[PDB]
Every structure is written in structure tokens, then in C-alpha cells.
Write an enzyme that holds these catalytic residues in place. Structure first.
Site, mmCIF file in Angstrom:
data_model
loop_
_atom_site.group_PDB
_atom_site.id
_atom_site.type_symbol
_atom_site.label_atom_id
_atom_site.label_comp_id
_atom_site.label_asym_id
_atom_site.label_seq_id
_atom_site.Cartn_x
_atom_site.Cartn_y
_atom_site.Cartn_z
ATOM 1 N N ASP A 1 31.422 47.520 43.815
ATOM 2 C CA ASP A 1 30.406 46.154 44.461
ATOM 3 C C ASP A 1 29.973 46.454 46.407
ATOM 4 O O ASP A 1 30.104 46.826 46.960
ATOM 5 C CB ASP A 1 31.371 45.296 44.966
ATOM 6 C CG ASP A 1 32.043 44.493 43.810
ATOM 7 O OD1 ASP A 1 32.163 45.422 42.236
ATOM 8 O OD2 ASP A 1 32.301 43.732 43.454
ATOM 9 N N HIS B 1 27.229 44.184 46.920
ATOM 10 C CA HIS B 1 26.321 43.520 47.506
ATOM 11 C C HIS B 1 25.925 42.656 48.281
ATOM 12 O O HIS B 1 26.013 41.586 49.540
ATOM 13 C CB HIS B 1 28.108 42.008 47.593
ATOM 14 C CG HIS B 1 28.122 41.297 46.083
ATOM 15 N ND1 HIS B 1 27.658 41.132 45.234
ATOM 16 C CD2 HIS B 1 30.039 42.006 45.264
ATOM 17 C CE1 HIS B 1 28.176 40.518 44.538
ATOM 18 N NE2 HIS B 1 29.774 41.369 44.463
ATOM 19 N N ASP C 1 27.437 45.368 41.005
ATOM 20 C CA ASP C 1 27.185 44.417 41.794
ATOM 21 C C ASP C 1 27.069 45.012 42.778
ATOM 22 O O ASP C 1 27.396 45.095 44.576
ATOM 23 C CB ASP C 1 28.801 43.898 42.137
ATOM 24 C CG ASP C 1 29.442 43.169 41.224
ATOM 25 O OD1 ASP C 1 28.439 42.711 39.960
ATOM 26 O OD2 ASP C 1 30.509 41.960 41.567
ATOM 27 N N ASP D 1 23.000 39.966 45.204
ATOM 28 C CA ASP D 1 23.931 38.816 45.320
ATOM 29 C C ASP D 1 25.560 38.689 46.934
ATOM 30 O O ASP D 1 25.521 39.642 47.179
ATOM 31 C CB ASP D 1 24.894 37.804 44.077
ATOM 32 C CG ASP D 1 23.346 37.863 42.596
ATOM 33 O OD1 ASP D 1 22.837 37.527 42.807
ATOM 34 O OD2 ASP D 1 24.109 38.021 42.312
ATOM 35 N N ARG D 2 25.143 36.936 46.530
ATOM 36 C CA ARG D 2 26.541 37.123 48.552
ATOM 37 C C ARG D 2 25.560 37.375 49.306
ATOM 38 O O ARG D 2 25.152 37.099 50.290
ATOM 39 C CB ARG D 2 26.980 37.906 48.208
ATOM 40 C CG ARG D 2 27.539 37.606 46.557
ATOM 41 C CD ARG D 2 28.872 36.072 46.356
ATOM 42 N NE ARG D 2 29.292 36.000 45.590
ATOM 43 C CZ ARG D 2 30.086 34.671 45.483
ATOM 44 N NH1 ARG D 2 30.475 34.240 45.728
ATOM 45 N NH2 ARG D 2 30.941 34.725 43.821
ATOM 46 N N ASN E 1 28.446 42.526 36.949
ATOM 47 C CA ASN E 1 28.146 40.927 36.150
ATOM 48 C C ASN E 1 27.039 40.280 36.945
ATOM 49 O O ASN E 1 26.358 39.219 36.758
ATOM 50 C CB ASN E 1 29.586 40.352 36.016
ATOM 51 C CG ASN E 1 29.716 40.022 37.798
ATOM 52 O OD1 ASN E 1 30.246 40.990 38.067
ATOM 53 N ND2 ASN E 1 30.720 38.920 37.568
ATOM 54 N N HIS E 2 27.160 40.791 38.593
ATOM 55 C CA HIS E 2 25.504 40.571 39.012
ATOM 56 C C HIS E 2 24.961 40.689 38.692
ATOM 57 O O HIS E 2 23.521 40.089 39.781
ATOM 58 C CB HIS E 2 26.433 40.347 40.940
ATOM 59 C CG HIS E 2 27.149 39.434 40.983
ATOM 60 N ND1 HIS E 2 26.477 38.036 41.988
ATOM 61 C CD2 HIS E 2 28.132 39.000 41.067
ATOM 62 C CE1 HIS E 2 27.264 37.205 42.345
ATOM 63 N NE2 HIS E 2 28.689 37.672 41.241
ATOM 64 N N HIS F 1 32.199 48.243 35.734
ATOM 65 C CA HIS F 1 32.320 47.884 37.109
ATOM 66 C C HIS F 1 33.634 45.870 35.914
ATOM 67 O O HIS F 1 33.927 46.596 37.908
ATOM 68 C CB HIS F 1 31.200 46.623 36.967
ATOM 69 C CG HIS F 1 31.509 45.830 38.014
ATOM 70 N ND1 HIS F 1 31.295 45.952 38.659
ATOM 71 C CD2 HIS F 1 31.173 44.160 37.741
ATOM 72 C CE1 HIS F 1 30.880 44.410 39.930
ATOM 73 N NE2 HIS F 1 31.591 43.774 38.937
ATOM 74 N N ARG G 1 37.970 33.283 35.570
ATOM 75 C CA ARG G 1 36.350 33.603 35.669
ATOM 76 C C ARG G 1 36.556 32.317 34.249
ATOM 77 O O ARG G 1 34.575 31.818 34.152
ATOM 78 C CB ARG G 1 35.985 34.955 35.765
ATOM 79 C CG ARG G 1 36.653 35.803 36.964
ATOM 80 C CD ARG G 1 35.831 36.640 36.656
ATOM 81 N NE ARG G 1 36.761 37.905 37.534
ATOM 82 C CZ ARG G 1 35.803 38.404 38.143
ATOM 83 N NH1 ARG G 1 35.078 37.969 38.997
ATOM 84 N NH2 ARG G 1 37.078 39.225 39.351
ATOM 85 N N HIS H 1 35.001 44.717 40.698
ATOM 86 C CA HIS H 1 34.451 43.820 39.978
ATOM 87 C C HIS H 1 35.525 43.000 40.575
ATOM 88 O O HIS H 1 35.540 41.726 40.644
ATOM 89 C CB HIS H 1 34.560 43.548 38.894
ATOM 90 C CG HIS H 1 34.485 42.445 38.270
ATOM 91 N ND1 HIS H 1 33.271 41.293 38.920
ATOM 92 C CD2 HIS H 1 35.344 41.440 37.454
ATOM 93 C CE1 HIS H 1 33.883 40.875 38.045
ATOM 94 N NE2 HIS H 1 34.409 40.264 36.758
HETATM 95 C C1 LIG Z 1 38.541 36.658 41.691
HETATM 96 C C2 LIG Z 1 39.205 37.564 42.916
HETATM 97 C C3 LIG Z 1 38.255 38.481 43.534
HETATM 98 O O1 LIG Z 1 37.761 39.481 44.550
HETATM 99 C C4 LIG Z 1 36.315 38.738 44.271
HETATM 100 C C5 LIG Z 1 35.367 40.307 44.387
HETATM 101 C C6 LIG Z 1 34.457 39.608 45.882
HETATM 102 C C7 LIG Z 1 32.869 39.115 44.794
HETATM 103 O O2 LIG Z 1 33.138 40.538 44.804
HETATM 104 C C8 LIG Z 1 34.022 40.358 43.985
HETATM 105 C C9 LIG Z 1 33.882 39.488 42.581
HETATM 106 C C10 LIG Z 1 32.783 40.030 41.994
HETATM 107 O O3 LIG Z 1 32.477 41.478 41.232
HETATM 108 O O4 LIG Z 1 33.136 38.766 41.072
HETATM 109 C C11 LIG Z 1 33.162 38.673 43.771
HETATM 110 C C12 LIG Z 1 31.341 38.534 42.912
HETATM 111 O O5 LIG Z 1 30.430 39.711 43.352
HETATM 112 O O6 LIG Z 1 31.184 36.921 42.718
HETATM 113 MN MN LIG Z 2 31.560 41.468 39.289
HETATM 114 MN MN LIG Z 3 31.482 41.347 43.257
#
Ligand SMILES: CCCOC[C@@H]1C[C@H]2O[C@@H]1[C@H](C(=O)O)[C@@H]2C(=O)O
Ligand SMILES: [Mn+2]
Ligand SMILES: [Mn+2]
Length: 312
Positions: free
Chosen positions: A67, A69, A96, A99-100, A128-129, A177, A225, A252
Site C-alpha cells: 500500500d 495510499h 491501495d 485514498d487516505r 480494495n481501495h 492485495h 471488516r 492490505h
Molecule cells: C486491520 C488493520 C490493518 O491495517 C490497516 C491498514 C491501513 C490501511 O491500509 C491497511 C488497510 C487496508 O489495506 O484495507 C487500510 C485501508 O486501506 O483502509
Molecule cells: Mn487494502
Molecule cells: Mn490499504
């Protein structure tokens, strides 16, 4: 007027250097050039299998990143620590990208640009993002609308739909991912046959690849989740055996150290967003692989300064 320009409508190494510098200085790539990268990269990605299969000869290396982000300045740090992408320096970015972080447009257009410049040596796997539901909530749709238009985001979404879901190196390392599957008996053949040009279903192989997480205990659990599953060391072991694989590389999940080796070395997490959201304080990592030795070599890195724009 001195913005980065395509040459005969095509991405060049000169253009990429200009783009990265432009973005470092918080400037916007012209909408028409952004459009061209998006339509061209859609064409490239749509021709790819859902499972990308890469052969890494004895002497060739590859770098796997997790990731990112929208942490654009940390992305550039990766390239400074590990070298720019090239035919002799290939990359895989494991979902990923957006986002964020507040520089998602800069990350993704940089990644797409390098995808166009080195199609056979620069690999992007869907996270997933890279979906509508997530983009709507977690910053990317907003960022695109603020920097460009609503229509531009629709094009981004339609491009994301063509991103491959997994990559296999030398028939031995599988990269996705999220992780493995809610059901037993899924094979590489099933993955190849996924019609991926869509938003992920609420359950299924496509959903699992983007969403699932490993758990320490045997068997499976409902995901915290609310979608997909948690899978144990026994699930990993069987899947790898049935498919003649060595181990998996996934992302992820944030780790304080930026990586985790789990399931008896069979499930590897790599996460490439250091000090995630300017808050988590985690290190990040990237992985080196060789093919003469497909065993992962981990490289930890720390966050670098970025301009004063808050997350989201
Ligand atoms: C359950 C906690 C694990 O860590 C979460 C991370 C922060 C972000 O990246 C991952 C997680 C993911 O990939 O889905 C978060 C995100 O993408 O929202
Ligand atoms: Mn993810
Ligand atoms: Mn992520």
C-alpha cells in the site's frame, strides 16, 4: 506554461522526470495529458490477464511494494532508495495506491505513467481501495473532483476495473492485495478466469483477493471488516500445495515494522506507506526477489517530510 508534455502523445523517461518534479512542487498535470495517460493505460491493462504471470530469469531482480495510499513523497523516496523503474529495475505495486493520503492523484498518475513507459516491467495490482465504495468515502473521489472534474473520476474508476488481481512469479510466488479464499479448492485457473472489469462482488474469489486477511489460528473466521474472511495457516498451506506454489505476498494491513512473515513463512505481508496517515508511526518496507532466489529480502524505510496538506 512549462508543464510536463507528452511527446507525440507518448510517455517518455524525460516526461516522467518532469512529472515527478512537477508533482513534488504541488502543481497539476494538465487535464488533457491526464486524460491521455488514462485512456492509453486502460488499453494496456484491458489486454492483460486477471493473473499476470512473470518469468524472472536467473540474473533478474524485482521489487514488490505494498500500500502507498497517496503518500507521494514517500513514493519518490522508494525510487531514491531503490532506483527509478526500468527494464533492469522492475516494480510491482500491490494495490491501495489511493485514498487516505492527500496526494493520491500524484501517486496514481505517476504509477500509470511508469506503467505506460515500462509495460512489461512495471506492474500494478488492484487493491480494495481501487473501487467505488472506498473512493467515495476515503478521499480519492473528492481529490479528483477538487483537482479535475466528476467525469475524470469516472474515467479513473473505469481504469481501476482493468487492473489485474494477482501476479505469479516463476510459478512459485503468488502476489495479491488481500489474500486467500473463503472456500476450499480455488486454483490459479479460477483466478485467470475471473472477469475483473467490474466492482468487486460482496463475496467470491474477486472479493477475497482484495479483502481477506491471515489469522494465526487454523480454519476460517468472519472478517472484522464485514466482508470476505480471515484464513489460517492450514488454509494457506493447502492452497499453496494444490497450486504448486512456494508462498504468498500480500499487503492490505499496516505493520509497525512495515512487513510480517506469518503462517510458517508461507504468508508474507508487505506495507509501503510509512507513518501512515501522518499518525501510525509505522515503518514501511519493500521486497527484493531474484529468481535465483525467490526468498524475500526486506528493506525497511521511514517517512520523509511532505508539504502541509492534512490527510483527506
Ligand atoms: C486491520 C488493520 C490493518 O491495517 C490497516 C491498514 C491501513 C490501511 O491500509 C491497511 C488497510 C487496508 O489495506 O484495507 C487500510 C485501508 O486501506 O483502509
Ligand atoms: Mn487494502
Ligand atoms: Mn490499504
Amino acid at each position: 506554461y512549462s508543464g510536463p508534455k507528452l511527446e507525440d502523445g507518448k510517455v517518455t523517461i524525460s516526461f516522467m522526470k518532469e512529472l515527478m518534479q512537477w508533482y513534488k512542487d504541488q502543481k497539476k498535470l494538465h487535464r488533457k495529458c491526464a486524460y491521455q495517460i488514462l485512456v492509453q493505460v486502460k488499453e494496456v491493462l484491458s489486454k492483460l490477464s486477471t493473473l499476470v504471470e512473470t518469468t524472472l530469469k536467473e540474473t533478474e531482480k524485482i521489487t514488490v511494494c505494498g500500500d502507498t495510499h497517496g503518500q507521494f513523497y514517500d513514493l519518490l523516496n522508494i525510487f531514491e532508495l531503490n532506483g527509478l523503474p526500468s527494464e533492469t529495475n522492475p516494480y510491482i505495486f500491490n494495490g491501495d495506491f489511493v485514498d487516505r493520503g492527500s496526494f493520491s492523484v500524484e501517486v496514481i498518475l505517476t504509477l500509470f505513467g511508469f506503467k505506460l513507459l515500462y509495460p512489461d516491467h512495471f506492474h500494478l495490482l488492484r487493491g480494495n481501495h481501487e473501487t467505488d465504495n472506498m473512493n467515495q468515502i476515503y478521499g480519492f473521489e473528492g481529490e479528483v473532483k477538487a483537482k479535475y472534474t466528476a467525469q475524470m473520476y469516472e474515467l479513473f474508476s473505469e481504469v481501476f476495473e482493468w487492473l489485474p488481481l494477482a501476479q505469479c512469479i516463476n510459478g512459485k510466488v503468488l502476489i495479491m492485495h488481500g489474500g486467500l479464499f473463503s472456500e476450499d479448492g480455488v486454483t490459479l485457473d479460477d483466478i485467470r478466469k475471473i472477469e475483473r472489469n467490474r466492482q468487486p462482488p460482496d463475496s467470491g474469489p474477486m472479493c477475497d483477493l482484495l479483502w481477506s486477511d491471515p489469522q494465526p489460528q487454523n480454519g476460517r473466521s468472519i472478517s472484522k471488516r464485514g466482508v470476505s474472511c480471515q484464513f489460517g495457516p492450514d488454509v494457506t498451506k493447502a492452497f499453496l500445495e494444490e497450486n504448486n506454489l512456494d508462498y504468498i505476498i500480500r499487503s492490505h494491513e499496516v505493520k509497525a515494522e512495515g512487513y510480517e512473515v506469518a503462517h510458517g513463512g508461507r504468508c508474507v505481508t508487505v506495507f509501503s506507506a510509512p507513518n501512515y496517515c501522518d499518525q501510525m508511526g509505522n515503518k514501511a518496507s519493500y521486497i527484493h526477489l531474484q529468481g535465483s532466489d525467490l526468498r524475500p529480502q526486506f528493506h525497511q524505510f521511514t517517512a520523509v517530510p511532505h508539504p502541509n496538506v492534512k490527510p483527506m
